[PDB]
Amino acid sequence: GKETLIPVFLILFIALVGLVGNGFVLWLLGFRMRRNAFSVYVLSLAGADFLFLCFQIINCLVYLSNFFCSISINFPSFFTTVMTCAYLAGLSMLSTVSTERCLSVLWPIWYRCRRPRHLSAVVCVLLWALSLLLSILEGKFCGFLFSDGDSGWCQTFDFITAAWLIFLFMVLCGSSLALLVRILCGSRGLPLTRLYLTILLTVLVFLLCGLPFGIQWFLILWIWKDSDVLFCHIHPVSVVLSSLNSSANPIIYFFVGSFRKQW
Amino acid sequence: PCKNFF
Ligand SMILES: CC(C)CCC[C@@H](C)[C@H]1CC[C@H]2[C@@H]3CC=C4C[C@@H](O)CC[C@]4(C)[C@H]3CC[C@]12C
Numbered sequence: 001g002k003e004t005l006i007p008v009f010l011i012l013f014i015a016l017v018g019l020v021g022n023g024f025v026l027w028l029l030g031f032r033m034r035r036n037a038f039s040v041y042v043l044s045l046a047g048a049d050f051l052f053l054c055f056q057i058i059n060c061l062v063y064l065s066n067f068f069c070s071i072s073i074n075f076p077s078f079f080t081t082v083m084t085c086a087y088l089a090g091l092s093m094l095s096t097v098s099t100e101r102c103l104s105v106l107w108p109i110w111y112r113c114r115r116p117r118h119l120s121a122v123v124c125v126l127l128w129a130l131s132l133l134l135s136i137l138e139g140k141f142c143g144f145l146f147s148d149g150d151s152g153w154c155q156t157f158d159f160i161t162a163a164w165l166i167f168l169f170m171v172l173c174g175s176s177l178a179l180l181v182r183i184l185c186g187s188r189g190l191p192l193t194r195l196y197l198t199i200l201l202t203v204l205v206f207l208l209c210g211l212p213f214g215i216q217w218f219l220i221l222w223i224w225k226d227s228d229v230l231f232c233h234i235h236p237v238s239v240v241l242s243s244l245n246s247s248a249n250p251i252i253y254f255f256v257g258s259f260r261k262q263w
Numbered sequence: 264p265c266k267n268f269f
Pocket residue numbers: 040043044047048121124125128129132
C-alpha cells in the first residue's frame with residue numbers, strides 16, 4: 001500500500017532521468033557524432049537500457065493508475081521477458097566494454113592494426129542474440145508468454161541465467177583487474193589516479209546496482225522462499241537499484257568521456 | 264504464472 005508507493009515515485013523520477021539521458025545518447029551516437037569501434041558498445045548499451053527504463057516507467061505508471069483510479073490495466077505477459085532481455089543485454093554490454101578496454105591495454109599493436117572493423121558489431125549482435133535466447137526460454141517455461149509452463153522446469157533454466165550472470169560479473173571483475181595490473185606495473189604517460197578511480201567506480205556500480213536486481217529476481221527469490229519478507233521489503237529496493245544503474249550508465253560511459261572537453 | 268511477478 002503506502003510502503004510501496006514511496007519507492008515507486010523514486011522509480012518514475014530516476015527512470016525519467018535515465019530515459020532522457022539514454023535518448024540523448026542514442027540520438028547523438030546514431031546521427032550527430034562519428035562512431036569509433038568502441039562507440040557501438042555505448043550505443044548498444046543505451047539501446048538495451050532504453051527498453052528496460054521504458055518498461056519501468058510503464059510498470060510504475062500503471063501502479064499509480066491502479067492505486068488511485070483503479071482501472072485495473074491487465075498487461076500482456078510478454079513484457080517481462082523483453083524487459084529481462086533488455087536488462088541482460090545491458091549487463092553484457094558492460095562486461096564487454098570492460099573486456100575491450102583490457103584487450104586494448106594488454107595488446108595495443110593488435111588493437112590498432114589487426115583488429116577487424118566489424119568485430120564490435122558481431123560481438124554486440126551475438127550477445128544480444130544470446131540474451132534474447134536466455135530471455136524467451138525463461139519466458140516460455142515460466143508462463144510469461146502465450147502458453148504456460150511448469151515451475152519445476154522453470155527453476156532449472158532460471159538458475160542458468162543466474163550462473164550466466166555470475167560469470168558475466170566475474171568476466172568484468174577479472175578483466176578490469178588485469179588492466180589495473182598492467183597500468184600499475186609498467187605504464188608511463190597515463191593518468192593513473194583518474195584511471196583507477198573510473199575503473200573502480202564502474203566495478204562498484206556494476207556490483208552494487210546492476211547485479212542486485214538480477215540476483216534477487218532469479219537466484220535469490222527461488223532459494224530463499226520467504227515470501228512475506230522478500231516482496232514487501234526486498235523487491236522495491238532491488239528494482240530501484242537496478243533502475244538507478246541504468247540511469248547512471250550513460251553518464252559514466254558516454255557523457256563523462258565525451259563532454260569532458262566542453263567542461 | 265509460475266513467477267511471483269513484480
Ligand atoms: C539478433 C537480434 C536479436 C539482434 C537485434 C537486437 C536489436 C534490438 C538492436 C538493439 C541495438 C542495435 C545495434 C545498435 C548499433 C549498431 C551499430 C551498427 O553499426 C551495427 C548494428 C548495431 C550493432 C545494432 C544491431 C541490432 C541492435 C543490437
